[PDB]
Design a protein around this ligand. Structure first.
Ligand SMILES: *[C@@H]1O[C@H](CO)[C@@H](O[C@@H]2O[C@H](CO)[C@@H](O)[C@H](O)[C@H]2NC(C)=O)[C@H](O)[C@H]1NC(C)=O
Ligand SMILES: *[C@@H]1O[C@H](CO)[C@@H](O)[C@H](O)[C@H]1NC(C)=O
Ligand SMILES: *[C@@H]1O[C@H](CO)[C@@H](O)[C@H](O)[C@H]1NC(C)=O
Lengths: 50, 49
C-alpha cells in the first residue's frame, strides 16, 4: 500500500556563524556611485547577511 | 563397433533478483510540495508498482 518514513523533528544545521556581519550599506548608502559602463565591484564575503 | 558416453552442460536461466521500485521518494524525495505536485500527474507510480 505505502511506505514507512521517519518525519523530521529538529535541525542539526552544522556551520558556526561568522564573526562579522555583511556591510550591505557600502553599496547602498555610498556617498557616490559609478556609471553603467565602469561600475564599482565590492566583493562581500565571510560575513552574515540580512 | 564402439560407443562413447558423453556428458554435456546446458545452462538455462530461471529467474532474476526481484526489485521493488518506490516511485515517490525516488522521484520527489522527502519534499512534500513535490509529492503534492506529482499527485496531479495521475496513477503512474501505482501502475508501475
Ligand atoms: C571400445 O572403446 C573403449 C574405450 O573407449 C575400449 O576400452 C579400452 O580397452 C583397452 C583394452 O581392451 C583398455 O586398455 C582401456 O583401458 C579401455 N578404456 C577404458 C576407458 O576403459 C574398448 O576396448 C573398445 N572396444 C572395442 C571392441 O574396440
Ligand atoms: C555569532 O555567534 C556568537 C556566539 O558564538 C554571537 O555572540 C554573535 O553575536 C553571533 N553573531 C555574529 C557575529 O555573527
Ligand atoms: C545608510 O542608510 C542605511 C539605510 O537607511 C542606514 O541603516 C545607515 O545607517 C546609513 N548610513 C551608513 C553609513 O550606512
Amino acid at each position: 500500500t505505502s511506505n514507512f518514513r521517519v518525519q523530521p523533528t529538529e535541525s542539526i544545521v552544522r556551520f558556526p556563524n561568522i564573526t562579522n556581519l555583511c556591510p550591505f550599506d557600502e553599496v547602498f548608502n555610498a556617498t557616490r556611485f559609478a556609471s553603467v559602463y565602469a561600475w564599482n565591484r565590492k566583493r562581500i564575503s565571510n560575513c552574515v547577511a540580512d | 563397433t564402439n560407443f562413447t558416453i558423453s556428458v554435456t552442460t546446458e545452462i538455462l536461466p530461471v529467474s532474476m533478483t526481484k526489485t521493488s521500485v518506490d516511485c515517490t521518494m525516488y522521484i520527489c524525495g522527502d519534499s512534500t510540495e513535490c509529492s503534492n505536485l506529482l499527485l496531479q500527474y495521475g496513477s503512474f507510480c501505482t501502475q508501475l508498482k
